[PDB]
Design a protein around this ligand. Structure first.
Ligand SMILES: *[C@@H]1O[C@H](CO)[C@@H](O[C@@H]2O[C@H](CO)[C@@H](O[C@@H]3O[C@H](CO[C@@H]4O[C@H](CO[C@@H]5O[C@H](CO)[C@@H](O)[C@H](O)[C@@H]5O)[C@@H](O)[C@H](O)[C@@H]4O)[C@@H](O)[C@H](O[C@@H]4O[C@H](CO)[C@@H](O)[C@H](O)[C@@H]4O)[C@@H]3O)[C@H](O)[C@H]2NC(C)=O)[C@H](O)[C@H]1NC(C)=O
Ligand SMILES: *[C@@H]1O[C@H](CO)[C@@H](O)[C@H](O)[C@H]1NC(C)=O
Ligand SMILES: [Ca+2]
Lengths: 640, 245, 896
């Protein structure tokens, strides 16, 4: 009757706290549990050993937290494994899990984006763990030239540096021009290399900046007006610029650029402004193809050259990557599960974006054949469409179209996806569905999680609870139980969202029972929930003096720094002129979360082909004493 | 008037002033003292039984000195004011892990310009480290016995048949001393393991590398996986164990 | 003057960092709602721009956090913007623009802008006279003040401009720095490329490489070069044969069944499979979960085998059957290898060992079989009679040595038994005829390191084709024998012999299993497993390369290791001198020597894309005609081009002529330009729709003088296409042309010792010439004059050596004297003419074989009158002085 199960992340990372969920379903009294982790397959060393007791007071559920030591035993090219062994009294449940060397994250910050030969590159290396918390470890730093050849190596420790490692490199007067790289990695994990690029070039600061701004970020192929562009020219300090502009347009296919000499226009600059237009006629004439549809998929670039009336200043600016599209929008199903539960609601997470890749706000979307199923995208450009599935093994096909009023059907974005049926144990027709309200979720809000159950009446009464687990930043954040009373189709879980949930998390739930031919059955489901991106704390830089006062060269100024208490704040001041020449590779909080999201062990938005697939897709391993377990994972990265 | 033009607090006289009484309309040119600037000479004049100011608007202000200058790996603060004028001092301070070269850490804005030169900061350094006997230094930026500087870390690895004794890693600390003591490479050896709930079959206590330790388990207990241990540079792999079964 | 700041009272802005405020702060202030606020005082830089302040925080609890960019705009009502190019060519006349800005809403300012003097540059500004322009700047307007300068010495030079406004307490200045690059063009010469491999290319373990100096025959005079010495390790992967695919071994996993003999037959494959899979680490492809199931089969086979263990600790097919020597020895062989997989009782293993020694070994050291096994097929090659004592003794011996580490502490006789068994093999090894016995016996001896000399030779020669040990009969014996040989070779550390042998085993495509395959299956996988275990990760790379530069105090050594093989190690030297490179140790490396230098450019570096001709002529308080001619150098006509024109000081274009040019005709002039009154119009821009590449496009307009000055700055004209500013052509124009140009005269001051032969006296020459500084003194005849675009070469023939030093030049030999073109007009050297020349040692250029002279400021160049002129009474004084000077130097020389 009793079934002892264990749950761990698909990948166990070194020098990081890992959690293990232990359960004893249909068990009675106190159940002693001992967990040990040995290396595979030799079992030379006992990496970890923990003990716990599963009493009825804890619903026969408890967890074990263990930190695998960075032993020199885990050393080429072959993946390492460990054996997680849990002993529930007499019963022994073991599982082989994949191991990652990745110790944490390394973020590199350079003072500037571009440098001149003979100058010094000041850069900081932030050392943190998987929880983005400051740690003291040995780091290997390599300065790599454009060729890709390292011209300098060094090994340093971040201990007593509060996670901030200040470094510097002197660029020789004689040096190869181009993109230089800064490679860094923890000593323990050489495989995981973090990089940052900085350009080396001979240059002088512009004096004034030029902004090339098209009316629309994109160009509709059937727009008679053509591409309309506004040329903005202003001195770096603010004052507007008076001069003459030289603007030319061109088409880009891949890396092949085609110039449009016919479009070259010389326009005056009045009060730091000017306008130029690329007529559709000139665009079509420039290319040798009558078919305008062919241009779709390519992009346009605008080259502008502003010269002051003094003739002492000249600046070159450009906007490239302007997509030639048939639709202002684009639909993605990347956040939508590819598996559905027949006879249960299927939730689609439509992702609408602009041609540039940015989210689209308040864009109407709906499923063909179901006008009733219309929704509006949130600030993140995501909308939820719920359709009612009928009991069948036939592949589900969904086509989503935008219903943005003011646009014609030809300009509406469209996309089609396919969902496969969730395979049930012995064709019992038992399913589990998790649904979450689609709205921008912030730390401090309460998220209601809906547990929808589907199964024959004969065994429905047996289910008295759901086991849920929360996956964040690649590790188990929380685990609990959701009680259910017989006859309840739906039960709600008031889940509190804290800073720990940033930037996103997966919620996987499951239940077990003995139905049909006395078969032990496990039904599982999972959902991916996105959380508003931001700092766990907060950091702001503002003026500390009256606004009336204007900064004068060589004058004293007061800066107001408001942030977390006891936090170490590193500062830097860069001349905007530098960004005029290069604005690539600038450190932002968003880029940090991007890296964290990449490392995620989960590979799907949710659900799976079967209960086993549900756990694995979420980045989890399930193993029971009876025999139910997830397949082995030997891949460190997610499937393409 | 019947006297000589008054000695101003920040101005000076240019004339010799040997005469006693001076005619009406006589201009007494006042030069601008060192460390002060103006559009021109603040000129006084004698009229109505007193030396009035021909140039009321014209005034001498403290001479502005340029920016004191910033030194690599160092910051500065201003003393005796908040402006780079004559009479202020710029005190310099080196960053963590950096020591001040010299003992003069200030620049005093004087009549001609800033006094001295911009203080120089140099990264603290630690004594060079040699390779331990029967061991080598896997880490380090090459160069045999080259004085390391703040931040650099060093690791030690012993040769085959040897195990390290002491800390494995160390780094150049803030005061120029290594964080840990240099380790030694001692021949691999192992003491006879104390097997809980079991007893050693062999009588030998001292074991060399790759030597195997045999043991049996007390009744009521049985082998945890393997049934013997092996001597390694890290100890007994695996460790003797007996679980109830 | 009056109502204006003195130049000395003005301190120019010099701090123009592209980035600063690289500081650290700690928020230790009392928190308010979790937020601590700190007021930080900073001093803004001199740069007139907007600063973007980025802040990052790190917290033990909160973690990392990147703040939003905070901007700070720094500006002044009145300031100067000195626009300097990244670099300028030495001895090339260039124009820099100083722009004065006035942002006062409605107030004009009368400003006096001055360009400070600098020995490094040659401008109208001198130590004697100041260069000042008084100009009026309207409100919300800016004025461009042109400056023409000529860099004299290369390196990071400084340019400074100050300015002060009248009747106001306002002043400003700019002190920027630009780089001065030699007239030549950057070039790189690959001097040498040598492969470093001491053990392979060197002698006695060391490799020496002598590197020659770079040619540098075309090197620009008075310019330094730099030689790079690049070292890099060459990582070489170890060529190891691929391991047997795990999928091939699915059949090896077998459930042990049967009696004493068959139980081992079934246990053999599973044990050796788990062993091989562990070594090669292929449980990923095989199935991580499956391993546990395999161990259970091994434990199962071990447990069942114990049932056939007799009280004597020996083994047999049946409990009532006589113990088999071979079977018992095999049980020890398999069990000893399984101690790593499952729990093996020492009492059982060692007990069997002690039985073999005390019951089955003879005084001579031979093991004897008294009860053969029923399964004669499980013994492999031992079945073929012939030298059975050698075969059986070796087999049992091998088992004993594998059990040594386990049973040596329990069995006191083991060490002696092993030695005695080896004694027998050692003595009767040479007589062996069959390859099988030689292979198995060789391995037994090799374990003790007793396979040496003739025995070793026999073992190696027995192998056919140096890849296998085979005999007439079943192939399984051959695969088995060759496996023993492989283990022996690995024991011998013979890396050269292993590869062919291993390749043969793999090509046999045998993966165990089948009838009579127990020995072949167990041995083939044990040998292959050992091969993978011994195989090195990579070829050793530990080079010791040291450089020996003749101008360095001590040798520079580099320790190149595997982990830092790719690291590019560099050494730089200013001197162009040969050096030696010594390397020793194992591994391979690369040595590359490259020299960066400035090579004289025979062609014109400037005006490569545009042809520009500017002419200035008096007009028919003054007027002149400026006519500009331009042509595009290309296959097609040029697109929209710009005519950046700068007026001569005190001159301005005519409004009427500009309007006529503005009218269509593919010439555009912005209204802004047309509006400016005749005053303060020293800059003009003329936009052209296109210029012809077929012929010259000429345009002209009138210029009127409004202001009068003594020193007049030359004007400038610049042409370039909008898309490319670098590819331009600048031409300077100035009156008096159909040199007096201060900028021209100033540049030629340091060409050589300026003086008149009249002022020069005999005593004067003796005083100056004998000075220690002077290294050489020659009576020369100019044989040839080779003029060039940048440097002129004068081939002087040494007619007499008045005084010689470092350069041991003989009479009749020729030396080449070099000097910048700017000095050609000042020197006025003519062929067939004689000269008295002397200079310093610093004048030398190049090396001994082709040593040249550089005419510098300290070089004395006096014209020596011919015999024709010497007869004239006016030339008598100089001719006689030179004659007496030569006599006093040749006969008496210098005092001392
Ligand atoms: C695997 O299991 C572990 C525990 O085995 C889980 O971590 C625990 O999560 C609980 C919530 O489920 C957390 O409770 C928090 O507690 C903070 C206050 O900080 C902590 O307080 C604890 C109080 O217990 C103390 O016991 C010690 C020893 O006897 C005494 O000395 C002390 O006087 C207390 O009695 C303490 O153990 C911690 O060290 C720390 O001080 C609370 O603010 C907050 O709420 C608490 O719990 C509930 C709300 O859930 C509330 O009713 C209570 O009043 C209390 O305020 C926090 O929720 C703890 O962090 C963890 N407990 C332990 C023992 O560490 C872990 O979540 C789980 N992992 C997974 C993936 O499932
Ligand atoms: C060196 O020479 C090569 C070949 O001319 C050239 O491509 C390269 O730009 C030069 N620069 C260096 C130092 O590699
Ligand atoms: Ca998020």
């Amino acid at each position: 009757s009793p079934m002892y199960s264990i749950i761990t992340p698909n990948i166990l990372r070194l020098e990081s706290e890992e959690t293990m969920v232990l359960e004893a379903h249909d068990a009675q009294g106190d159940v002693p549990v001992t967990v040990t982790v040995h290396d595979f397959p030799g079992k030379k060393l006992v990496l970890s050993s923990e003990k716990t007791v599963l009493t009825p007071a804890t619903n026969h559920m408890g967890n074990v937290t263990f930190t695998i030591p960075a032993n020199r035993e885990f050393k080429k090219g072959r993946n390492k494994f460990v054996t997680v062994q849990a002993t529930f009294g007499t019963q022994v449940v073991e599982k082989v899990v994949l191991v990652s060397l990745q110790s944490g994250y390394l973020f590199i910050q350079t003072d500037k984006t571009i440098y001149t030969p003979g100058s010094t590159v000041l850069y900081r290396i932030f050392t943190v763990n998987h929880k983005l918390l400051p740690v003291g470890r040995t780091v290997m730093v390599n300065i790599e030239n454009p060729e890709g050849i390292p011209v300098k190596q060094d090994s340093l420790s971040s201990q007593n540096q509060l996670g901030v490692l200040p470094l510097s490199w002197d660029i020789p007067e004689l040096v190869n021009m181009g993109q230089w790289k800064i490679r860094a990695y923890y000593e323990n994990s050489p495989q995981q290399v973090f990089s940052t690029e900085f350009e080396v070039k001979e240059y002088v600061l512009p004096s004034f900046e030029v902004i090339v701004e098209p009316t629309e970020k994109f160009y509709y192929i059937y727009n008679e007006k053509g591409l309309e562009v506004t040329i903005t020219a202003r001195f770096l300090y603010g004052k507007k610029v008076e001069g003459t502009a030289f603007v030319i347009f061109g088409i880009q296919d891949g890396e092949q650029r085609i110039s449009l000499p016919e479009s070259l226009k010389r326009i005056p600059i009045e009060d730091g402004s000017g306008e130029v237009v690329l007529s559709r006629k000139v665009l079509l004439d420039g290319v040798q193809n009558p078919r305008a549809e062919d241009l779709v998929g390519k992009s346009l670039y605008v080259s502008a050259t502003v010269i002051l009336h003094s003739g002492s200043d000249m600046v070159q600016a450009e906007r490239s990557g302007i997509p030639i599209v048939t639709s202002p929008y684009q639909i993605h199903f990347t956040k939508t599960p590819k598996y559905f539960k027949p006879g249960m609601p299927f939730d689609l997470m439509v992702f609408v974006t602009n041609p540039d890749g940015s989210p689209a706000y308040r864009v109407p979307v709906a499923v063909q054949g179901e006008d009733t199923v219309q929704s509006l995208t949130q600030g993140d450009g995501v909308a939820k469409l719920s359709i009612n599935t009928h009991p069948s093994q036939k592949p589900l096909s969904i086509t989503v179209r935008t219903k943005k009023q003011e646009l014609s059907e030809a300009e509406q974005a469209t996309r089609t996806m396919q969902a496969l049926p969730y395979s049930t144990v012995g064709n019992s027709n038992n399913y589990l569905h998790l649904s979450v309200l689609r709205t921008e979720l912030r730390p401090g809000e309460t998220l209601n999680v809906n547990f929808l159950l589907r199964m024959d009446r004969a065994h429905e009464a047996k289910i008295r609870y759901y086991t849920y687990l929360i996956m964040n930043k690649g590790r188990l954040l929380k685990a609990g139980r959701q009680v259910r009373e017989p006859g309840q189709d739906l039960v709600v879980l008031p889940l509190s969202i804290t800073t720990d949930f940033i930037p996103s998390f997966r919620l996987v739930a499951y239940y077990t029972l003995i139905g049909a031919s006395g078969q032990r059955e496990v039904v599982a489901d999972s959902v991916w929930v996105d959380v508003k991106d931001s700092c766990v704390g907060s950091l702001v830089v503002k003026s500390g003096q009256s606004e009336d006062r204007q900064p004068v060269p060589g004058q004293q100024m007061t800066l107001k720094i408001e942030g977390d208490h006891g936090a170490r704040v590193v500062l830097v001041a860069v001349d905007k002129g530098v960004f005029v020449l290069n604005k690539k590779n600038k450190l932002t909080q968003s880029k940090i979360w991007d890296v964290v999201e990449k490392a995620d062990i989960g590979c799907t938005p949710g659900s799976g082909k079967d209960y086993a697939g549900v756990f694995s897709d979420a980045g989890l391993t399930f193993t029971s004493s009876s025999g139910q377990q997830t397949a082995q994972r030997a891949e460190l990265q997610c499937p393409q | 008037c019947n006297e000589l033009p008054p000695r101003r607090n920040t101005e000076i006289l240019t004339g010799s002033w040997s005469d006693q009484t001076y005619p009406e309309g006589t201009q007494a040119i006042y030069k601008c003292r060192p460390g002060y600037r103006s559009l021109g000479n603040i000129i006084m004049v004698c009229r109505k039984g007193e030396w009035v100011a021909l140039n009321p608007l014209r005034k001498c202000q403290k001479r502005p000195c340029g920016h004191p200058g910033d030194t690599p790996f160092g910051t500065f603060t201003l003393t005796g004011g908040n402006v780079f004028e004559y009479g202020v001092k710029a005190v310099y301070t080196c960053n963590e892990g950096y020591q001040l070269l010299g003992e003069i850490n200030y620049r005093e804005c004087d009549t001609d310009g800033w006094t001295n030169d911009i203080p120089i900061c140099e990264v603290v350094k630690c004594l060079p480290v040699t390779a331990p006997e029967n061991g080598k230094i896997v880490s380090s930026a090459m160069e045999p016995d080259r004085e390391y500087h703040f931040g650099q870390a060093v690791r030690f690895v012993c040769n085959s048949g040897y195990k390290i004794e002491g800390d494995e890693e160390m780094h150049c600390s803030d005061d120029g001393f290594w964080s840990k003591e240099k380790p030694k490479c001692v021949e691999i050896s192992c003491k006879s393991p104390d097997v809980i709930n079991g007893s050693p079959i062999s009588q030998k206590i001292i074991y060399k590398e790759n030597e195997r330790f045999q043991y049996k388990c007390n009744m009521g207990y049985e082998y945890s996986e393997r049934g013997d241990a092996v001597c390694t540079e890290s100890g007994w792999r695996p460790l003797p164990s007996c679980e109830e079964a | 003057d009056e109502d204006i700041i003195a130049e000395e009272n003005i301190v120019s802005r010099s701090e123009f960092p592209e980035s600063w405020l690289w500081n650290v702060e700690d928020l230790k202030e009392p928190p308010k709602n979790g937020i601590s606020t700190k007021l930080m005082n900073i001093f803004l830089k001199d740069s007139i721009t907007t600063w973007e302040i980025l802040a990052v925080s790190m917290s033990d609890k909160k973690g990392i956090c990147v703040a939003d960019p905070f901007e700070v705009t720094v500006m002044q009502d009145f300031f100067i913007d000195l626009r300097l190019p990244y670099s300028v060519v030495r001895n090339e006349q260039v124009e820099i623009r100083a722009v004065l800005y006035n942002y006062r809403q409605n107030q004009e300012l009368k400003v006096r802008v001055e360009l400070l003097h600098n020995p490094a540059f040659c401008s109208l500004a001198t130590t004697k006279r100041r260069h000042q322009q008084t100009v009026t700047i309207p409100p919300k307007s800016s004025l461009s003040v042109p400056y023409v300068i000529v860099p004299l010495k290369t390196g990071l030079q400084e340019v400074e401009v100050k300015a002060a406004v009248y009747h106001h307490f306002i002043s400003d200045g700019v002190r920027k720095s630009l780089k001065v690059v030699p007239e030549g063009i950057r070039m790189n010469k690959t001097v040498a490329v040598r492969t470093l491999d001491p053990e392979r290319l060197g002698r006695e373990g060391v490799q020496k490489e002598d590197i020659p100096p770079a040619d540098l025959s075309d090197q620009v005079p008075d310019t330094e070069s730099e030689t790079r010495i690049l070292l890099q390790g060459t990582p070489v992967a170890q060529m190891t044969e691929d391991a047997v695919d795990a999928e091939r071994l699915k059949h090896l996993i077998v459930t042990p069944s049967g009696c004493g003999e068959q139980n081992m037959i079934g246990m053999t494959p599973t044990v050796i499979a788990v062993h091989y899979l562990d070594e090669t680490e292929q449980w990923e492809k095989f199935g991580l979960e499956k391993r546990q199931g395999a161990l259970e089969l091994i434990k199962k086979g071990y447990t069942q085998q114990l049932a056939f263990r007799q009280p004597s600790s020996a083994f047999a097919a049946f409990v009532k059957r006589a113990p088999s020597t071979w079977l018992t020895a095999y049980v020890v062989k398999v069990f000893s290898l399984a101690v790593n997989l499952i729990a093996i009782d020492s009492q059982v293993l060692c007990g069997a060992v002690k039985w073999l020694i005390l019951e089955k070994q003879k005084p001579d050291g031979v093991f004897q079989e008294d009860a053969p096994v029923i399964h004669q097929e499980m013994i492999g090659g031992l079945r073929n009679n012939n030298e059975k004592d050698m075969a059986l003794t070796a087999f049992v011996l091998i088992s004993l040595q594998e059990a040594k580490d386990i049973c040596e502490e329990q069995v006191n006789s083991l060490p002696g038994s092993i030695t005695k068994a080896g004694d027998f093999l050692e003595a009767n090894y040479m007589n062996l005829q069959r390859s099988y016995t030689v292979a198995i016996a060789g391995y037994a001896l090799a374990q003790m390191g007793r396979l040496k000399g003739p025995l070793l030779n026999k073992f190696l020669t027995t192998a056919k084709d140096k890849n296998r040990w085979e005999d007439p009969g079943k192939q399984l014996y051959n695969v088995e024998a060759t496996s023993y040989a492989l283990l022996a070779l690995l024991q011998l550390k013979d890396f050269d012999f292993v590869p062919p042998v291993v390749r043969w085993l793999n090509e046999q495509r045998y993966y165990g299993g089948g009838y009579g395959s127990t020995q072949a299956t167990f041995m083939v996988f044990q040998a292959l497993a050992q091969y993978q275990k011994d195989a090195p990760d990579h070829q050793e790379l530990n080079l010791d390369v040291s450089l020996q530069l003749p101008s360095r105090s001590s040798k520079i050594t580099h320790r190149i290791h595997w982990e830092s093989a790719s690291l590019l190690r560099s050494e730089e030297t200013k001197e162009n001198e040969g050096f030696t490179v010594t390397a020793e140790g194992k591994g391979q490396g690369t040595l590359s020597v490259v020299t960066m230098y400035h090579a004289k450019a025979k062609d014109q570096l400037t005006c490569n894309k545009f042809d520009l001709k500017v002419t200035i002529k008096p007009a028919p308080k003054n007027t002149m005609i400026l006519e500009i001619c331009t042509r595009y150098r290309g296959d097609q006509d040029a697109t929209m081009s710009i005519l950046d024109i700068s007026m001569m000081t005190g001159f301005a274009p005519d409004t009427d002529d500009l309007k006529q040019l503005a009218n269509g005709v593919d010439r555009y002039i912005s209204k802004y330009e047309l509006d400016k009154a005749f005053s303060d119009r020293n800059t003009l821009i003329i936009y052209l729709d296109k210029v012809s590449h077929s012929e010259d496009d000429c345009l002209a307009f009138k210029v009127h003088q409004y202001f009068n000055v003594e020193l007049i700055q030359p004007g400038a004209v610049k042409v370039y296409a909008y898309y490319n500013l670098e590819e331009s052509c600048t031409r300077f124009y100035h009156p008096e042309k159909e040199c007096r140009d201060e900028l021209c005269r100033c540049a030629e001051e340091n060409c050589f010792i300026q003086k008149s032969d009249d002022k020069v006296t005999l005593e004067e020459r003796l005083d100056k010439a004998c000075e220690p500084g002077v290294d050489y003194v020659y009576k020369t005849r100019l044989v040839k004059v080779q003029l060039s675009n940048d440097f002129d070469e004068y081939i002087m023939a040494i007619e007499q050596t008045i005084k010689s030093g470092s350069d041991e030049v003989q009479v009749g030999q020729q030396r080449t004297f070099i000097s910048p073109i700017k000095c050609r007009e000042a020197l006025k050297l003519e062929e067939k003419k004689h000269y008295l020349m002397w200079g310093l040692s610093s004048d030398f250029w190049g090396e001994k074989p082709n040593l040249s002279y550089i005419i510098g400021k300290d070089t004395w160049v006096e014209h020596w009158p011919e015999e024709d002129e010497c007869q004239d009474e006016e030339n008598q004084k100089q001719c006689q002085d030179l004659g007496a000077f030569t006599e006093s130097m040749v006969v008496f020389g210098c005092p001392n």
